[PDB]
Amino acid sequence: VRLSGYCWRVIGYHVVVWMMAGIPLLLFRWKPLWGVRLRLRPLAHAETLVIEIRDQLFTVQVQTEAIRVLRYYLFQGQRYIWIETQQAFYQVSLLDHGRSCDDVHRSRHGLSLQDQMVRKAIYGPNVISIPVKSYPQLLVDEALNPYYGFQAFSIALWLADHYYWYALCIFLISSISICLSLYKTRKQSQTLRDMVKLSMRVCVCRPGGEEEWVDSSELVPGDCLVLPQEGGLMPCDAALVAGECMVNESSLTGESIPVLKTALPEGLGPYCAETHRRHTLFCGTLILQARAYVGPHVLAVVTRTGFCTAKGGLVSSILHPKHSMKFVAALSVLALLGTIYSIFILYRNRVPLNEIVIRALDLVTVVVPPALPAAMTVCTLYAQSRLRRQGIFCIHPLRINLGGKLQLVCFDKTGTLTEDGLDVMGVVPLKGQAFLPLVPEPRRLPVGPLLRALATCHALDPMDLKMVESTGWVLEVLAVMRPPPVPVSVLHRFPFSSALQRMSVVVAWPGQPEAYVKGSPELVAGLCNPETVPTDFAQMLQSYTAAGYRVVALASKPLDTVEGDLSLLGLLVMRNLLKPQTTPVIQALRRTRIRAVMVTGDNLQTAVTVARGCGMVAPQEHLIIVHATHPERGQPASLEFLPMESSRHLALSGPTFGIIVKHFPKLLPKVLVQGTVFARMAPEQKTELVCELQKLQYCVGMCGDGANDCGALKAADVGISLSQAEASVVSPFTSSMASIECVPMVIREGRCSLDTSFSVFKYMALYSLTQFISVLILYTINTNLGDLQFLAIDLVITTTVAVLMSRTGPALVLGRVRPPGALLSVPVLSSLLLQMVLVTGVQLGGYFLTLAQPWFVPLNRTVAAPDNLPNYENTVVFSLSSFQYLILAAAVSKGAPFRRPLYTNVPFLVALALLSSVLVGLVLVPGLLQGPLALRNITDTGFKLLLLGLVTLNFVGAFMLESVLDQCLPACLRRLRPKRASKKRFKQLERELAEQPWPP
Ligand SMILES: CCCCCCCC(=O)OC[C@H](COP(=O)(O)O[C@@H]1[C@H](O)[C@H](OP(=O)(O)O)[C@H](O)[C@H](OP(=O)(O)O)[C@H]1O)OC(=O)CCCCCCC
Ligand SMILES: CC(C)CCC[C@@H](C)[C@H]1CC[C@H]2[C@@H]3CC=C4C[C@@H](OC(=O)CCC(=O)O)CC[C@]4(C)[C@H]3CC[C@]12C
Ligand SMILES: CC(C)CCC[C@@H](C)[C@H]1CC[C@H]2[C@@H]3CC=C4C[C@@H](OC(=O)CCC(=O)O)CC[C@]4(C)[C@H]3CC[C@]12C
Ligand SMILES: CC(C)CCC[C@@H](C)[C@H]1CC[C@H]2[C@@H]3CC=C4C[C@@H](OC(=O)CCC(=O)O)CC[C@]4(C)[C@H]3CC[C@]12C
Ligand SMILES: CCCCCCCCCCCCO[C@@H]1O[C@H](CO)[C@@H](O[C@H]2O[C@H](CO)[C@@H](O)[C@H](O)[C@H]2O)[C@H](O)[C@H]1O
Ligand SMILES: CC(C)CCC[C@@H](C)[C@H]1CC[C@H]2[C@@H]3CC=C4C[C@@H](O)CC[C@]4(C)[C@H]3CC[C@]12C
Ligand SMILES: CC(C)CCC[C@@H](C)[C@H]1CC[C@H]2[C@@H]3CC=C4C[C@@H](O)CC[C@]4(C)[C@H]3CC[C@]12C
Ligand SMILES: CC(C)CCC[C@@H](C)[C@H]1CC[C@H]2[C@@H]3CC=C4C[C@@H](O)CC[C@]4(C)[C@H]3CC[C@]12C
Ligand SMILES: CC(C)CCC[C@@H](C)[C@H]1CC[C@H]2[C@@H]3CC=C4C[C@@H](O)CC[C@]4(C)[C@H]3CC[C@]12C
Ligand SMILES: *[C@@H]1O[C@H](CO)[C@@H](O)[C@H](O)[C@H]1NC(C)=O
Ligand SMILES: CCCCCCCCCCCCCC
Ligand SMILES: [NH3+]CCC[NH2+]CCCC[NH2+]CCC[NH3+]
Ligand SMILES: CCCCCCCCCCCC
Ligand SMILES: CCCCCCCCCC
Ligand SMILES: CCCCCCCCCC
Ligand SMILES: CCCCCCCCCC
Ligand SMILES: CCCCCCCCCC
Ligand SMILES: CCCCCCCCCC
Ligand SMILES: CCCCCCCCCC
Ligand SMILES: CCCCCCCCCC
Ligand SMILES: CCCCCCCCCC
Ligand code: BEF
Ligand SMILES: [Mg+2]
């Protein structure tokens, strides 16, 4: 957390940095401080560049501006300013901490223009600027990968060794990949910048009157907005100081229900907005309307701006957040050994120094394939095209591999698991003091008062629209309804009073005038006569509200004068229905041991009811709600466990999650291990939960749809967006169709990308290593393959097999078993080692067998490697190795259970057959392609048949070796060291809870 400030030397550093030619790696290595120490020229008060460790290192420039002196710097989107009173930097977001509500009210009048200028210079513009970088900036930042440097070095060596064609191919691949990467990264950054941009004309009063109009960018905390009478997005965070408003906070909570925000209660005591959330207007939330009732207009004082806002925090978290495939020790040591052996034998076989250097360096490129990442990404490109053919669109194909090893999925409730809106579940008529049975659809009912009220009473508001749609009375005196009977026209109406949640309408028909009142249950029931209102109004209503539903009371009277003498006609119940495809998908995931979690901004009751309905909680499984009371400061916070109607499941609330994180760090892992519902979660709390679960060694994905769950999608390993706007920006994946079915197929696709990649990896390793071995053999006798032979091994065979072995698709089903995750696993290493023992055996045996012939004559070693050809050793070794490459490519690839069977991809098998056909033609057919490829045309037929038999033996041996390894290695692994006790943190916690269940 500590920091320091570093006050000619740049010229020396630039020369030294450029002269070293490798110090950039050392600077980019563990020790970068020296690189900054020399350049920065190492007080806090007097500095021009600051460095801070987060205990980690980060460097920032101490920006400055003139107002009468200011020194400030940005970090993670948060501004800090230097203060001379304490001679130190302070975060601007805490400049006015714990303002009293009366102090806020004292700013009822706006902010003076001079004070506006100085305060803008302090806080800065109200915009959230995304620092989009230029193309060279992106190149130096996100394309400094050392593999690209190695590829460039290998290319340069190959042009220095006359191997032009493959070097050109690798250069084209790397350049195109780099260009596409930079382009898409820039496009993503630009789109994010567009998404967060906001522009409005906002009114601000002044103490000199004449309330001016300014841009959203000019607002600073302390002036007050005159909220528009109609509505619109909120430019920043603010506190209502005069009037009431109805807001649509779907951006924070994910629900579109109107929310009432009243004025701030004037008085002493600090204003925090954690407890005054009901009196604060947040940035981005849409204002449905603003009614003053006092004074000329609604006034709301600004409190936060820019990154300080909730949207600011979310975007800041978004901006500021296999792996074992890059093992280093074995390859480095092997390359070193092979190199020193090459120099030893080469100096034993006298050849020029430059040739020795070129050969020894080229052996390194033989060892490490420069085409490996392209081979890795071919299958991900296949998977991306496959997904895009069925809706899901991806931006980072290499991310698809993470889908294979996914084991935990979080789901938003509204819009994702349930419809993005409420729907009529049914109406509950009551004749006397007893409710009649719930009616599924209100259309089939008599023409009594209840149906008339169901058809007429409305403000015509998605809710009334759904009501009118369900009742079916088509519109055609403020209206005339047609029953699909009698025509009921609306004779008079009244506005829906925001304070008293009533809406009354008086109607009449050709057949007395009658009033119908729609409102909240308890208040309207209180308006009604207790004679008709039943005894059990509290329980018939708690049965629905506790079950996540929202009830509305209908009252009536045959005609304040209107909503007086009333009798209840029924109750209309609304419900957020599960989408038709969520239960099958959820149960499909559950039967494969992929844990599903709900992370909602809704209340807990709706969350738990939906969780039970969709199958996340089986009917026989327990469920417990953990509640954490806030610390009173006399006694600490303490947890209380509440069971419900009755694998254990825990339903955690929103504030209680933060309480457990802050005051119970030790028990948080236990709760996270077996927690399934997280309700009333803030947009940052979703990201926090995702981060903690990832800290528990999980591979978490999320399928959010709304704006609130955008940071979580960015933080998740595999994020999926069901909305084509406001959330596709951050999500790696986006599905045009909006339901949970996108989740499983992606997982299936991911497994292919995680499985095929493994096979591809193995082949590449083998391709390199066997080639290395062959080179060594020839290097042992002052000979080399040949340029055309090298191209015919590197260009055609590798590219053909690598691309054609990636065509295979998934197996149409989700098994309970994940594919292997770590490339350095025992099975991978054992398979590679055994295959190479076989390959080395065949090559050395062939070499030692071809020497015992009457017709063999050794090459003369007085001549260089390429001028020794055509040559017996070269042709024999090339003939064996060329078949070996195809054998390895065929044996390495797999089929079920993660991919389709290996015999489906007819193109791959046909390619193998054709390549083997041309190779056997080269071995047998004399002098047809042996001009280009310097082969010596073995004349003895028996030896050629023996070579064919030997390579056939290698073929069958390799396939049988792979089969027996796959079908008998798990048994050996289990029988050795049976105390497995898997090292993953969540598995360890699961076992610990299994022995001793934490909730007693
Ligand atoms: C020289 C370098 C060699 C590297 C060796 C590789 C490392 C090594 O040993 O794996 C541990 C193995 C098993 O390791 P291995 O099976 O290869 O992989 C492990 C488990 O499979 C674990 O399984 P779960 O219970 O399902 O988690 C989990 O999946 C992790 O793999 P993941 O990437 O798929 O998540 C690993 O923790 O444990 C023994 O089976 C005893 C025999 C070990 C013999 C040790 C001799 C060295
Ligand atoms: C693996 C090895 C061979 C690395 C090869 C890297 C190349 C792919 C780099 C080297 C120089 C780069 C170019 C350097 C400069 C520009 C100028 C740039 O145009 C501008 O000058 C404006 C850029 C801006 O304002 O952001 C467009 C990209 C381009 C062609 C770059 C594209 C990518 C190039 C060709
Ligand atoms: C000459 C050297 C440098 C080798 C270059 C090999 C390329 C010619 C390969 C590499 C990536 C391949 C592509 C990888 C993925 C696909 C997706 C694939 O899409 C599907 O067939 C599935 C979608 C569907 O059918 O639903 C079509 C072929 C294509 C474009 C491949 C065509 C051939 C490409 C361009
Ligand atoms: C000097 C001599 C060695 C000439 C070598 C010419 C190469 C540039 C040719 C030979 C074989 C060709 C490959 C043969 C087959 C394919 C399969 C082809 O497959 C697909 O297009 C996708 C198939 C699918 O998606 O189902 C992609 C190009 C590729 C790798 C070809 C790219 C160009 C290659 C490497
Ligand atoms: C041996 C056979 C050789 C096969 C040759 C033919 C295949 C050539 C494919 C080259 C890869 C092109 O594909 C491009 O690769 C780069 C990195 O590799 C990916 O880049 C990836 O990482 C970068 C960051 O490093 C991310 O910003 C980007 O989102 C992500 O996808 C591009 O998203 C992918 O589109
Ligand atoms: C044994 C002797 C003769 C070999 C000497 C060759 C050296 C210089 C080669 C081998 C591998 C090469 C490096 C591989 C990785 C990196 C990191 C990259 O970000 C910059 C280039 C750089 C630094 C390469 C260039 C130089 C390099 C270090
Ligand atoms: C001169 C000496 C080093 C012999 C030559 C061996 C070189 C080529 C070896 C030694 C260590 C190796 C590097 C070790 C680490 C990584 C990280 C990985 O994510 C990309 C490949 C990369 C960058 C390797 C490429 C090959 C490498 C540079
Ligand atoms: C002719 C010799 C030098 C070989 C050059 C091959 C060229 C044509 C190769 C090199 C890299 C290749 C591209 C690499 C990746 C992609 C992205 C994929 O989503 C569609 C195909 C596409 C766009 C490829 C088209 C063909 C391509 C441009
Ligand atoms: C061209 C001449 C030499 C024939 C060579 C064909 C070889 C390379 C290929 C073509 C068809 C392939 C087989 C196709 C079907 C199956 C069943 C399945 O479990 C995968 C392996 C297996 C058993 C394959 C093994 C390798 C195979 C035999
Ligand atoms: C190998 O070297 C020479 C030329 O370098 C070549 O002509 C001849 O075949 C071989 N030398 C002998 C003595 O056979
Ligand atoms: C199976 C791979 C066969 C490779 C064929 C090589 C053909 C080279 C063309 C001829 C170039 C040299 C003629 C002077
Ligand atoms: N797989 C990368 C190895 C490439 N080896 C190519 C060696 C080319 C030899 N050229 C010798 C030039 C003789 N005039
Ligand atoms: C683009 C792939 C290379 C094809 C052209 C080169 C053919 C080999 C020429 C060998 C000359 C000795
Ligand atoms: C951290 C990535 C770079 C590691 C390179 C290892 C040293 C190579 C020889 C200098
Ligand atoms: C010839 C190099 C360009 C190949 C096409 C690049 C990507 C096209 C995306 C539609
Ligand atoms: C320099 C060749 C550029 C090819 C990629 C341009 C983008 C294609 C549309 C995504
Ligand atoms: C070299 C031309 C042949 C490439 C294969 C064509 C596609 C067949 C599988 C659909
Ligand atoms: C040359 C390798 C490709 C051959 C493909 C044959 C067509 C298969 C689809 C029926
Ligand atoms: C001794 C004559 C050669 C014997 C060859 C036996 C192997 C035939 C399988 C191709
Ligand atoms: C896939 C390796 C194929 C080896 C073929 C063996 C020769 C058979 C024809 C005599
Ligand atoms: C289940 C299919 C098993 C395939 C193994 C490979 C057989 C090779 C015969 C030579
Ligand atoms: F719409 Be979710 F419940 F945040
Ligand atoms: Mg939602």
Curated annotation (Swiss-Prot):
**Location in or out of the cell:** Lysosome membrane; Late endosome membrane; Endosome, Multivesicular body membrane; Cytoplasmic vesicle, Autophagosome membrane
State the name under which the record lists this protein: Polyamine-transporting ATPase 13A2
| SUPFAM superfamilies (UniProt xref) | Calcium ATPase, transduction domain A (SSF81653), Calcium ATPase, transmembrane domain M (SSF81665), HAD-like (SSF56784), Metal cation-transporting ATPase, ATP-binding domain N (SSF81660)
Q: What is the effect of changing residue 416 to I?
A: In SPG78; no effect on protein stability; loss of autophosphorylation; loss of lysosomal location; loss of ATPase activity
Which regions face the Cytoplasmic side of the membrane?
A: 29-142, 184-326, 384-757, 806-821, 897-907, 966-1000
> Mutating residue 894 to A: effect?
Reduced spermine-induced ATPase activity
Q: What is the lineage of its organism?
A: Eukaryota, Metazoa, Chordata, Craniata, Vertebrata
Active site per the UniProt annotation? 412 (4-aspartylphosphate intermediate)
Q: Which family does it belong to?
A: Belongs to the cation transport ATPase (P-type) (TC 3.A.3) family. Type V subfamily.
